[PDB]
Design a protein around this ligand. Structure first.
Ligand SMILES: [K+]
Ligand SMILES: [Mg+2]
Ligand SMILES: [Mg+2]
Ligand SMILES: [Mg+2]
Ligand SMILES: [Mg+2]
Ligand SMILES: [Mg+2]
Ligand SMILES: [Mg+2]
Ligand SMILES: [Mg+2]
Ligand SMILES: [Mg+2]
Ligand SMILES: [Mg+2]
Ligand SMILES: [Mg+2]
Ligand SMILES: [Mg+2]
Ligand SMILES: [Mg+2]
Ligand SMILES: [Mg+2]
Ligand SMILES: [Mg+2]
Ligand SMILES: [Mg+2]
Ligand SMILES: [Mg+2]
Ligand SMILES: [Mg+2]
Ligand SMILES: [Mg+2]
Ligand SMILES: [Zn+2]
Lengths: 177, 115, 7, 84, 60
RNA sequence: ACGACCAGGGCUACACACGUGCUACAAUGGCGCAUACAAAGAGAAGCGACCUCGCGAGAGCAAGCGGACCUCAUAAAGUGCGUCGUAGUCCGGAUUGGAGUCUGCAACUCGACUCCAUGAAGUCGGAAUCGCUAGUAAUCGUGGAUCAGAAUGCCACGGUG
RNA sequence: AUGUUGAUAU
RNA sequence: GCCGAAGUGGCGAAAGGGACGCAGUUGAUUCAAAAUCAACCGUUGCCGGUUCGAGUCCGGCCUUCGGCACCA
RNA sequence: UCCUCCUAAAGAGUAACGGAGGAGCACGAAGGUUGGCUAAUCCUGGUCGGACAUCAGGAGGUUAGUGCAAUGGCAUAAGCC
């Protein structure tokens, strides 16, 4: 809610002024934040997937969805419908709380943080970033890590351009290099 | 127990625990602790939160971890881009400090690859 | 043999 | 490395040739044998053709080369792999 | 939210070394004690020459 | 010119194979603090104390000594106490980065040493193979020749045994 | 038990 | 002209998600060579399919081998 | 023997030692119904992650899918949960 309140009170006014929008509905909102773990090694052992899910659950606060292979792929030795990943979709209050926890805590705790890339937009105002270790989230205990395990965050936006996209995140002081 | 963006060991004496920081050896580890005013035999587990914070301030006086790693990486990249002798040695993966390559030099050359 | 000795 | 109290080393023949070269302008390269001479700031810009044993290798002196010896930019041994 | 599938997710304090107290919701269970936060981290705060070297060491 | 002089390079190269060594893989050990007991030897373009400065390699100043006198020069293993607790580690110290010192017209190719950082392989070694019968083997330091500088080699010396 | 061979001239 | 086998390491020859001999290479043993010992190295004729995936299944092609070519 | 296409001359049927392929099953769900859902492929961004895994968005519009050949069907899906 902190950053949701900050969005409504402060960010909307910045983006209105910046882009000279007619309507307030023309301002970029943050739609959702999808955390994904590709757990391709789980073909060997399903316990790793369970542990991966448990980590993503701790980070997010939601029980994750176990994703599965859209098709068989011989390169990675996966058949169709084999569980090879897991995701959480964060929307609303939980999204904003996570987005706080990411910016204020987790991103600082990245090893050798020199800003996030500003060229990591899809072309349609959505931002994606790799987390390389689950240690950056304090929710994970450092002691009980079986394997070091990253996840990809994606912040989906109602921004049309990347300029609108980056401006929105920049208004939250999203740490861009 | 978390200093310089790493989790240092808790059960170890502080002198040893600090050396887990990249850029901190035995001599610095002693200077850090002596500046912070912590006895070397103290286990990091036994320290209070304020004592950890003083150590973080003391460690911050030294170029460590990613600051150091990029200093080193730059210093090597500098040489390789110059095309100085040491540069060429770094590129080819051969001893840089004038050691013999007729024999030994396996640390640089890696395991032997037969003809 | 050896195509033609004592070493 | 050479003591700081002694200062840098350069051949007096090299020094004067460089001093003259800077005074005139960036001319045809300075053909030296003085591989042992330190590269000075005033050499920056000059091409110094340094002996490697058999030929004078052109070295265009940049900022990053300052402090190095001229010999560092003229390799003496030829090697292109075994069985190549 | 569904009932009794999710992690227990409740407000906890997170006091940084710099002194930034927070009140995040989290799964962790207890109050955190952070080493670094957004308000004090080098990048966020913004607290991150051979010819010069030559002139210093020798000074002719 | 197959003679002679010179500068720079090379003898230090490196897919690789072998010989001889050094250092290890640790707890009969590592580290810290304290404290015992040698022999033999060298020294004037030399050995260099004390004192002062430097974390240190060293630097400055300057006695003494051609030596049973002065100097190199604290022997180390040991012993006492503490710590580590079997870990690729407080084992190992390769490699590399940065910063230096000294010798020398000159340390790039290609010196030794110091400081900070780095912290590789290695957990006792396949077939095979070597030395040694006693103050020996094993292990521990010490000195010397060559030498401006440059030993893990060589030649020698005692300690434990 | 078994257990081969040793280039030419000198 | 027809019809069955096949084509795999250097050689011979085994096997819908590449081993065995010999050879070769390195080391050892020997005064030396062999024998021997210890390591190691190589890896699916061709083309197009089927398939998530082909040495492996399908079709065609090339090369080799075998058999059949009779009644007149 | 059986199935699909073509020969087959725009109804049906139609021969050859004509041209091409398949079957001799599977499934207690892969059947019934209710409710829901929509494909291939490529592009852009994204930890490990690569041409191709999982994630996000875009383009695209069934070029997918159909327990197994081919043909005719299939979005109100007959396709997916
Ligand atoms: K014979
Ligand atoms: Mg060190
Ligand atoms: Mg050398
Ligand atoms: Mg000469
Ligand atoms: Mg030699
Ligand atoms: Mg040690
Ligand atoms: Mg001497
Ligand atoms: Mg004497
Ligand atoms: Mg190992
Ligand atoms: Mg051990
Ligand atoms: Mg005897
Ligand atoms: Mg000795
Ligand atoms: Mg001498
Ligand atoms: Mg005979
Ligand atoms: Mg008809
Ligand atoms: Mg008709
Ligand atoms: Mg009829
Ligand atoms: Mg329905
Ligand atoms: Mg149905
Ligand atoms: Zn803070």
């Amino acid at each position: 809610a902190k950053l949701h309140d900050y969005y409504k009170d402060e960010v909307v006014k910045k983006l209105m002024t910046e882009f000279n929008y007619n309507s307030v509905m023309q301002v970029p909102r943050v739609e959702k934040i999808t955390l994904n773990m590709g757990v391709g090694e789980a073909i060997a052992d399903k316990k790793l997937l369970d542990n991966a899910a448990a980590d993503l659950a701790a980070i997010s606060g939601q029980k994750p969805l176990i994703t599965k292979a859209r098709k068989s792929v011989a390169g990675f030795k996966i058949r169709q419908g084999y569980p090879i990943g897991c995701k959480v979709t964060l929307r609303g209050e939980r999204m904003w709380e996570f987005f706080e926890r990411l910016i204020t805590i987790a991103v600082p705790r990245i090893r050798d943080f020199r800003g996030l890339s500003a060229k990591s937009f899809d072309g349609r105002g959505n931002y994606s970033m790799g987390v390389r270790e689950q240690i950056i989230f304090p929710e994970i205990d450092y002691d009980k890590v079986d394997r070091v395990r990253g996840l990809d965050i994606t912040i989906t936006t109602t921004a049309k351009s990347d300029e609108e996209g980056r401006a929105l995140l920049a208004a939250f002081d999203f740490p861009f290099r | 127990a978390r200093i310089a963006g790493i989790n240092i060991p808790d059960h170890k004496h502080a002198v040893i625990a600090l050396t887990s920081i990249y850029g901190v050896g035995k001599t610095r580890s002693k200077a850090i602790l002596a500046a912070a005013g912590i006895a070397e035999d103290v286990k990091i587990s036994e320290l209070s939160e304020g004592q950890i914070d003083t150590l973080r301030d003391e460690v911050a006086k030294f170029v460590v971890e990613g600051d150091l790693r990029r200093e080193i990486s730059m210093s090597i990249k500098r040489l390789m881009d110059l095309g100085c002798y040491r540069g060429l040695r770094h590129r080819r993966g051969l001893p840089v400090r004038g050691q013999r390559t007729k024999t030994n030099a396996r640390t640089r050359k890696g395991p032997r690859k037969p003809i | 043999x050896x195509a033609x000795x004592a070493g | 490395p050479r003591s700081l109290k002694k200062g840098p080393f350069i051949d007096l023949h090299l020094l004067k040739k460089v001093e003259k070269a800077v005074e005139s302008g960036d001319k045809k390269p300075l053909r030296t044998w003085s591989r042992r001479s330190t590269i000075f700031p005033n050499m920056i810009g000059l091409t110094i053709a340094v002996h490697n044993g058999r030929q004078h290798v052109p070295v265009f002196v940049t900022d990053e080369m300052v402090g190095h010896k001229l010999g560092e930019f003229a390799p003496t041994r030829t090697y292109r792999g075994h069985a190549a | 939210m569904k009932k009794d599938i999710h992690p227990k997710y409740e407000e906890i304090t997170a006091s940084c070394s710099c002194g930034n107290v927070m009140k995040i919701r989290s799964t962790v269970g207890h109050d955190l004690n952070l080493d670094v936060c957004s308000k004090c981290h080098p990048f966020f705060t913004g607290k991150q020459g051979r010819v010069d070297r030559f002139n210093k060491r020798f000074n002719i």
